[PDB]
């Protein structure tokens, strides 16, 4: 036997195969009934290979052919606006995709010289993020929080505010419910943000190897655009489930357990995936691929094995606490723990000019709030409440970068301190209407991407006269 | 055809060796045990033409080298209208007597879940009658509902109320699936079903505590297989009730050890996620029909971080968490108003007033929970006047969520009061705005409407 | 031609069998791959002329029954003049596309640790420019420095500053070792290095997150072996920066399981102390020359009881523990003054004016921590007049510790400020003497010298 063999043992979605003399590691295997596999454990005599999908069909004796190919995903511009599985086959149920190139699933991340420093913002359109925890193109930013804290809410809200900004989007649903994936598909296509977006789906019903591959397949499709020299925004929802799939594979393949029963290389699993996200140098196009991984904590337990793993890999993180979410602060972001390791490098100059101290002020305000249960502090605490009311914003309503700058200006420079706290949310709404209609200086801010002496004095006056009547 | 011999037995697992042809996975084998025959289910192909099989009944009596025959197909069950108003076994057999079934069609247990695009997107709620649920975590038609609760916090009681509110006075078909819970409840229900007259339209399947692991595992499916048939063949909207789905995932761990799998966290099976997905994704509303599933989830040692309850959360459109702290405080239904959430709670679906009020009470209750640490060691007198009013309102709102249940009428000795969604939002609004600050907090327990709350306050004065 | 052949492959762990003569442990094996060679390092002798190895790159492609060749010695690397200003990998090959490396001499990365006789009692300090450190935990010339912290606490940024302060200003060569951290940060350093002109006087070895286990394991030894050469052969002053020395241990644990090792406490390799001890003892100053090792240490989930940091602590002379509690307040560098230690904080070394204020500071802060329970629940209102002042003074010194960093102008949005040991001591001494009880505590946040802090109060 050469590039073939027979199954001497099968069960639980793995198969020990005899023969396959010159089968390479991570090779795509072909079984009867048109089901696929993947050789991983190349032992002395047998070959431990995991089966993708219909494992129940296989039984002892079945002949197995070796393709002599690494598992690869079909990548093209044709995919945009369509739903895909792990392998690349379309599960949208509306036609078929045709691609120019075939890209591999597993592949090393770029080198040191290959990259260049990130220095161009990926605008989420969320004031509390883009202001004090900004994200740049090529960055990796974790969205970590408990169940039902608004993790996916931030993920999609980001996608929503990439219409016209000319950035491809990839939502990788890992170990999710098909019912939930459908809800996503609709809301995106309803808002008309689907035609520059892809969805990779490896739902709970699908086998572990397909869940395992899902994010690696997702990023490979991203690399296609990156290499060509285009900006991408991949999203992994979520790596905490991705890990459990890899746990399933390993413990069945008889790769021994570690902490929380997870195998040895569950760091390396997410390390090589997230590292793959980067910004390349101008020599290789300058094409980016920003990654937003998601993690699901258990009762706020970040000491857990995977949550801690991912935090140490990424270029910062965003923390969501139900203590805020229930308190009526959406999106429920904790500024204290949330950090961005790129900083103001991935911000427009106008944004840096307003939202620099805002993080520190809020962190200090958080402390002094516990004490209030001096008159200089009584002023600081008043600004504290007001800042937060602005950082609070609804879902499916992402702000443009110009609208954010003015929102931070009014509170920071102290044009919001002589009105009621309840009405500050309404104040900024009416101001953005008044400034868009009358002054037409938002279009200037967007073009200039800075605060001139003119613009600041225009605001100074146009805000002053707006306070002629309070509603 | 395809007859084999038993090589070795190990409690609930049996290894069989076939000479010629080997049966596919999930195939039904049969052995001629003393008097009655036993049904086994093949799982793994070991080698040397041997297969490892999990038994559907007690293996006590099985000798080494006994004869066993392959059916060829998986375990197939009587499916359709014949089953209605009759309690079924794991194998699909009638255990109610009353003659054999009038089975026309048959259908296998193990069948793949509905693929993407066969699914349908529907986001319409329906009032349950229960105040805490209808406001905060409203259930969705054609959705998967989850009832999380520790040992004896009123999760079975809650189901029995929901079937009483929904399935009682509605034309749709129903399905119930007893999985590893009390056999007492089986007789209690079957009696209450017949005497009420709901029995006719609904169908029952049972595999309770007494049943071995293999049984408790597969019963979850057979009932679902029956529920699937009605959304597919007839194309009719059906309701599925399960108690308790945990006992299915539990059974897995008992078997997994014997199948020789390396245990994961807390000695569970390593394929916990997929084994559950291969079931939970099958319970879904398609285009052809629509299934509204309401399944109860046991939380072992009140530990929701436990991987069995932990993973189930990601299969649900609405979830109602039951806390022991609430039950112990003397409030039923013991629904945590902060931990319980539903996907439907959005301005899109429930409107403005519903959403605005729901988020407000959450904000108030959250603040009460925040200050609950300080009050415990010091007292109510210390916290500021601003907080004082929010705490007093919270305690009333918390106690107002309690209401008497029709099922627990014999228990509580009170007429269980169904409250419509529109009258609940009216109440929590009036309490929030502070128009019922004059009423004591002991006039909100087991009331229902706000009109009845003030009536209880006047009843005191007399 | 001491040829062998692969028997079985399991991820990074590859088993190989040799016909006649078997290769010794730790030596490098090469295998022919499509348009490239892969490097494996033998670790164990299984039996029947079979040996278990660990690949230095991904094993996706290896087939059973391929031609493997034995070099008959460990991973020998370039070292000397040539490596300066060049980015090297685990195998010492250049990864900067700046032409090939033509090196003067070639060492193996597996070397013996220097014996008891070879060491020397230096114990003389140098100032950093950072107030918190050089006061409460001063660093030692040719000593062993370590920076403990979790993730997002600010230990990478701290190394970057130490390089900016020390390695840029002072002469002599240096060596940075990127051991299994972010590749982004690699390019970010390389960018700052070339613009600053330090690149010429430094050699960079890398083996980042994206690299497999074997790489992240033995990369530390490559960067170490470069530094070993410079202290002995050349005889020049060396600065060895490593980030992160946890990832060395981590790489060990990944593979450990597949090498047939039973897992020890909290799922580490059972030979955690000796594996680390073998590498750490090798990083030292000697009679023939001295190296100043500044190696950052990750703290899994801020847990100092975790083995990886617990066994590391022993090896370091000066330890700068970073607390997330302090980072949460938003005062970088978030150094814990109670947990930070140095063997150089003694009357002998820094005199008694230094030593006494350093402790008196720690004494005040320890009292504040005790009283922090009371003010939380009962409040400041219910607190003695004697203690009230030792709270406010403690809060001011806590906030004065924070200073703006040159590298962290991108974060803080302020020009970074160096502060010498003299100016630091006087500043804190003046707060203890109760002089600046007039100046609010907000006026100490991210300020260089006390002179500036007193000014800032009225400035705003
Ligand atoms: N900025 C916001 N404003 C208002 N509501 C929000 C906001 N963000 C999230 N929500 C609401 O919070 C709920 C939970 O959001 P989401 O499902 O994104 O969180 P999640 O943690 O990803 O959920 P799951 O844990 O089920 O995956 C949703 O019903 C959504 O409507
Ligand atoms: N809605 C309710 N009203 C009053 N009492 C209840 C209610 N639900 C539960 N109880 C009390 O708690 C017990 C537990 O009910 P049960 O549904 O068996 O809990 P579980 O199914 O979680 O074990 C009941 O016997 C009853 O005494
Ligand atoms: N000197 C400093 N000044 C201000 N902020 C800092 C400083 N050092 C670190 N930080 C903060 O911490 C983050 C960087 O921490 P990092 O060096 O990555 O720590 P670690 O190596 O433990 O992950 C930045 O985003 C920044 O906000
Ligand atoms: Mg989500
Ligand atoms: Mg029960
Ligand atoms: Mg770091």
Atom of ligand 1 nearest to the CA of A150: 19
Nearest Cα to A82, choosing from A193, A173, A197?
A: A197
Domain C345-460 classification at class level: mainly alpha
Give yes or no: B181 in active site: yes
B152 in a labelled binding site: yes
Domain with CATH 1.20.150.20 in chain A: 348-471
Ligand 1 mutation target, pool B138, B339, B346, B363, most atoms within 8 A of CB: B346
Bridge partners for B402 per DSSP: none
Ligand 2 mutation target, pool B152, B181, B414, most atoms within 8 A of CB: B152
Distance from CA of A211 to the nearest CA of B (A): 10
DSSP states along C350-391:
HHHHHHHHHHHHHHHHHHHHHHHHHHHHT-SSSS-HHHHHHH
List Cβ neighbours of A434 (8 Å cut-off, separation of 6 or more).
A462, A466
Check if B76-343 and B345-462 are the same fold: no
Domain with CATH 3.40.50.300 in chain A: 70-347
Long-range contacts of B377-381 (CB under 8 A, 24+ apart): B377/C377, B378/C377
Q: Does B378 touch chain C (CB under 8 A)?
A: yes
Resolution value (Å, 1 decimal) = 3.6
Cα(B370) to centroid(ligand 2), Å: 28
List Cβ neighbours of B260 (8 Å cut-off, separation of 6 or more).
none
Query: In angstroms, rounded to a whole number, what is the distance separating the alpha carbons of residues B39 and B77?
Result: 13
Query: In angstroms, rounded to a whole number, what is the distance separating the alpha carbons of residues C251 and B159?
Result: 51
Q: Is A68 in contact with C32 (CB distance < 8 Å)?
A: no
DSSP states along B346-406:
SHHHH-HHHHHHHHHHHHHHHHHHHHHHHHHHS-TTTS-HHHHHHHHHHHHHHHHT----S
- The strand order across the sheet containing C202-207 reads C87-88, C202-207, C174-179, C238-243, C291-298, C144-149, C318-321, C341-342
- Give the pair of three-digit tokens for residue A360: 């520190």
The CA angle A320-A325-A328, to the nearest 5 degrees, is 140
Query: In angstroms, rounded to a whole number, what is the distance separating the alpha carbons of residues A131 and A401?
Result: 10
Nearest Cα to C403, choosing from C460, C452, C371, C445?
A: C445
| Burial (CB count within 10 angstroms: exposed 0-12, middle 13-18, buried 19+), residue B94 | middle
H-helix or E-strand containing A150?
none
H-helix or E-strand containing B8?
strand B3-10
Query: In angstroms, rounded to a whole number, what is the distance separating the alpha carbons of residues A45 and A66?
Result: 16
Question: Is A178 in contact with B314 (Cβ distance < 8 A)?
Answer: no
Domain A1-69 classification at class level: mainly beta
Nearest Cα to C160, choosing from C339, C409, C401?
A: C409
Q: Which ligand is nearest to the CA of B181?
A: 5
- Give the pair of three-digit tokens for residue A414: 């102290």
CB-ligand 3 contact for C333 (6 Å cutoff):
yes
Dihedral sign (CA B376, B381, B382, B388): positive
Q: With b meaning 16 or more CB within 10 Å and e meaning fewer, what string describes B312-348? A: bbbbbbbbbbbbeebbeeebbbbbbbbbbbbbbbeee
Nearest Cα to C3, choosing from C71, C70, C74, C75?
A: C70
Q: Which ligand is nearest to the CA of B178?
A: 5
Query: What beta strand segments (E) does B58-139 contain?
Result: 67-74, 76-79, 87-88, 105-108
Atom of ligand 3 nearest to the CA of A312: 23
Domain B1-74 classification at class level: mainly beta
- Give the pair of three-digit tokens for residue A386: 């007001």
| CATH architecture of residue range(s) A348-471 | Up-down Bundle (1.20)
Q: Domain limits of chain B?
A: 1-74, 76-343, 345-462
Give yes or no: B369 in active site: no
The CA angle A243-A246-A248, to the nearest 5 degrees, is 115
C153 in a labelled binding site: yes
- Residues, chain C: 460
Query: In angstroms, rounded to a whole number, what is the distance separating the alpha carbons of residues C43 and C25?
Result: 5
Query: What beta strand segments (E) does B21-61 contain?
Result: 27-31, 38-45, 50-55
CB-ligand 3 contact for C406 (6 Å cutoff):
no
| Burial (CB count within 10 angstroms: exposed 0-12, middle 13-18, buried 19+), residue A38 | buried
Query: In angstroms, rounded to a whole number, what is the distance separating the alpha carbons of residues C78 and A387?
Result: 57
Classify residue A187 by its DSSP letter: H
Contacts of A42 in chain C (CB under 8 A): 8-10, 62, 64
- Give the pair of three-digit tokens for residue A352: 């840096």
- Residues, chain B: 462
Query: In angstroms, rounded to a whole number, what is the distance separating the alpha carbons of residues C339 and B352?
Result: 54
B376 in a labelled binding site: no
Nearest Cα to C236, choosing from C222, C246, C226, C247?
A: C226
Q: Is B149 in contact with B298 (CB distance < 8 Å)?
A: yes
Nearest Cα to C397, choosing from C370, C372, C354, C360?
A: C360
Query: What beta strand segments (E) does B196-303 contain?
Result: 202-207, 238-243, 291-298
> Cis bond leading into A370, ω under 30°?
no
Query: In angstroms, rounded to a whole number, what is the distance separating the alpha carbons of residues A158 and A143?
Result: 12
Question: Is C152 in contact with A106 (Cβ distance < 8 A)?
Answer: no
Q: Is B313 in contact with B319 (CB distance < 8 Å)?
A: yes
Q: Give the active site residue among B30, B81, B182, B261.
A: B182
Give the helix ranges, DSSP H, for A2-150: 127-130
Query: In angstroms, rounded to a whole number, what is the distance separating the alpha carbons of residues C84 and C95?
Result: 13
The CA angle A89-A90-A96, to the nearest 5 degrees, is 100
Query: In angstroms, rounded to a whole number, what is the distance separating the alpha carbons of residues B429 and B440?
Result: 17
List Cβ neighbours of A419 (8 Å cut-off, separation of 6 or more).
A427, A470
Q: Could you tell me the fold of the domain covering B345-462?
A: 1.10.1140
Could you confirm whether domain A70-347 is CATH 3.40.50.300? Answer: yes
Query: In angstroms, rounded to a whole number, what is the distance separating the alpha carbons of residues B358 and B380?
Result: 26
Nearest Cα to C40, choosing from C56, C25, C26?
A: C56
C335 sits in the region (left: phi over 0; alpha: psi -120 to 50; else beta) called: beta
Q: For ligand 2, which residues put their CB under 6 angstroms from it?
A: B 149, 151-157, 332-333, 405, 408, 411-412
Give yes or no: A137 in active site: no
Query: In angstroms, rounded to a whole number, what is the distance separating the alpha carbons of residues A233 and A217?
Result: 14
The CA angle B340-B279-B175, to the nearest 5 degrees, is 75
DSSP states along B367-382:
HHHHHHHHHHHS-TTT
Give the helix ranges, DSSP H, for B105-165: 131-136, 156-162
**Cα C457 from chain centre:** 37
CATH of C76-343, picked from 3.40.50.11540, 3.20.80.10, 3.30.420.40, 3.40.50.300, is 3.40.50.300
Query: In angstroms, rounded to a whole number, what is the distance separating the alpha carbons of residues A439 and C273?
Result: 69
């Amino acid at each position: 036997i050469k590039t073939s063999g027979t199954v001497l043992e099968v069960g639980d979605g793995i198969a020990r195969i005899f023969g396959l003399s010159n089968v390479m590691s991570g090779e795509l295997l072909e079984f009867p009934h048109g089901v696929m596999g993947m050789a991983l454990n190349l032992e002395e005599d047998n070959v431990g290979a995991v089966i993708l999908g219909n494992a129940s069909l296989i039984k002892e004796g079945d002949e197995v052919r070796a393709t002599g190919k690494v598992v690869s995903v079909p990548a093209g511009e044709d995919l945009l606006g369509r739903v895909i599985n792990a392998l690349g086959d379309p599960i949208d149920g509306k036609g078929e995709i045709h691609v120019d190139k075939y890209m591999p699933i597993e592949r090393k991340a770029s080198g040191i010289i290959a990259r260049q420093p990130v220095s161009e913002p990926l605008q989420t359109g969320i004031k509390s993020i883009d202001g004090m925890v900004p994200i740049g193109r090529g960055q990796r930013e974790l969205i970590i929080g408990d169940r039902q804290t608004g993790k996916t809410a931030i993920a999609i809200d980001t996608i929503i505010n990439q219409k016209g900004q000319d950035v491809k989007c990839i939502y990788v649903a890992i170990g999710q419910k098909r019912s939930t994936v459908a809800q996503i598909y609709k809301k995106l296509s309803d808002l008309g943000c689907m035609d520059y977006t892809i969805i990779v789906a490896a739902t709970a019903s699908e086998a572990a190897p397909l869940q395992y591959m899902a994010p690696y397949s997702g990023v490979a499709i991203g690399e296609y655009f990156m290499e060509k020299g285009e900006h991408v925004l991949i999203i992994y929802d979520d790596l905490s489930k991705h890990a459990v799939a890899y746990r399933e594979m390993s413990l069945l393949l008889r790769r021994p357990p570690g902490r929380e029963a997870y195998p040895g290389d569950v760091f390396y699993l997410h390390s090589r995936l997230l590292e793959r996200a980067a910004k390349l140098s101008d020599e290789l196009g300058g094409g980016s691929i920003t990654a937003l991984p998601i993690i699901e904590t258990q009762a706020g337990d970040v000491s857990a094995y995977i949550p801690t793993n991912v935090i140490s890999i990424t270029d910062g993180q965003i923390f969501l606490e139900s203590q805020l979410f229930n308190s009526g602060f959406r999106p429920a972001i904790n500024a204290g723990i949330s950090v961005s390791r790129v900083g103001g490098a991935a911000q427009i100059k106008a944004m840096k000019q307003v939202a620099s101290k805002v993080k520190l002020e809020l962190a200090q305000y958080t402390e002094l709030l516990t004490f209030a249960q001096d008159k200089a502090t009584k002023a600081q605490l008043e600004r504290g409440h007001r800042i937060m009311e602005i950082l609070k914003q609804p879902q499916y309503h992402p702000f443009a970068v110009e609208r954010q700058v003015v929102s931070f200006y009014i509170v920071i420079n102290g044009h919001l301190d002589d009105i009621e706290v309840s009405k500050v949310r309404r104040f900024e709404k009416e101001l953005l209407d008044y400034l868009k209609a009358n002054t037409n200086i938002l279009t200037e801010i967007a073009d200039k991407k800075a605060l001139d002496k003119d613009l600041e004095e225009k605001l100074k006056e146009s805000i002053a006269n707006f306070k002629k009547s309070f509603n | 055809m395809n007859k084999g011999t038993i090589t070795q037995i190990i409690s609930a697992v049996v290894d069989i060796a076939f000479k010629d042809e080997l049966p596919a996975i999930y195939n039904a084998l049969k052995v001629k045990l003393e008097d009655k025959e036993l049904v086994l289910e093949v799982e793994q192909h070991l080698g040397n033409n041997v297969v490892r099989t999990v038994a559907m009944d007690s293996t006590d009596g099985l000798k080494r080298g006994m004869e066993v025959i392959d059916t060829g197909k998986p375990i197939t069950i009587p499916v359709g209208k014949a089953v209605l108003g009759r309690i079924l076994n794991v194998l699909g057999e009638p255990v109610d007597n009353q003659g054999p079934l009038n089975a026309e069609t048959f259908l296998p247990i193990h069948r793949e879940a509905p693929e993407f695009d066969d699914l349908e997107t529907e986001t319409e709620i329906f009032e349950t009658g229960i105040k805490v649920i209808d406001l905060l975590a409203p259930y969705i038609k054609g959705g998967k509902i989850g009832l999380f609760g520790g040992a004896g916090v009123g999760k079975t009681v809650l189901i029995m109320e929901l079937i009483n509110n929904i399935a009682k006075g509605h034309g749709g078909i129903s399905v119930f699936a007893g999985v590893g819970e009390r056999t007492r409840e089986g007789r209690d229900l079957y009696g209450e079903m017949t005497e009420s007259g709901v029995i006719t339209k609904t169908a029952l399947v049972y595999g309770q505590m007494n049943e071995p692991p293999g049984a408790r595992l597969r019963v979850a499916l057979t009932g679902l297989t029956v529920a699937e048939n009605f959304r597919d063949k007839d194309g009719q909207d059906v309701l599925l009730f399960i108690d308790n789905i945990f006992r299915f995932t539990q059974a897995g761990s008992e078997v997994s050890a014997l199948l020789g799998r390396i245990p994961s966290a807390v000695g569970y099976q390593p394929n916990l996620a997929t084994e559950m997905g291969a079931l939970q994704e099958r319970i879904t509303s398609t285009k052809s029909g629509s299934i509204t599933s309401v399944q109860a989830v046991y939380v072992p040692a009140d530990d929701l971080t436990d991987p069995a309850p932990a993973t189930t959360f990601s299969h649900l459109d609405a979830t109602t968490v039951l806390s022991r702290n609430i039950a112990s405080l003397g409030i039923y239904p013991a629904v945590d108003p902060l931990d319980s959430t539903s996907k439907a709670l959005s301005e899109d679906v429930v409107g403005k007033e519903h959403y605005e009020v729901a988020r407000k009470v959450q904000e108030v209750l959250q603040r009460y929970k925040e200050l609950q640490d300080i009050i415990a060691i010091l007292g109510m007198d210390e916290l500021s006047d601003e907080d004082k009013l929010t705490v007093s309102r919270a305690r009333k709102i918390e106690r107002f969520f309690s209401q008497p249940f029709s099922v627990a009428e014999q228990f509580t000795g009170m007429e269980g009061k169904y409250v419509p969604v529109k009258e609940t939002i009216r109440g929590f609004r009036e309490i929030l705005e502070g128009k019922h600050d004059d009423i004591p907090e002991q006039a909100f327990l087991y009331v229902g409407t706000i009109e009845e709350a003030v009536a209880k306050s006047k009843d005191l004065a007399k």
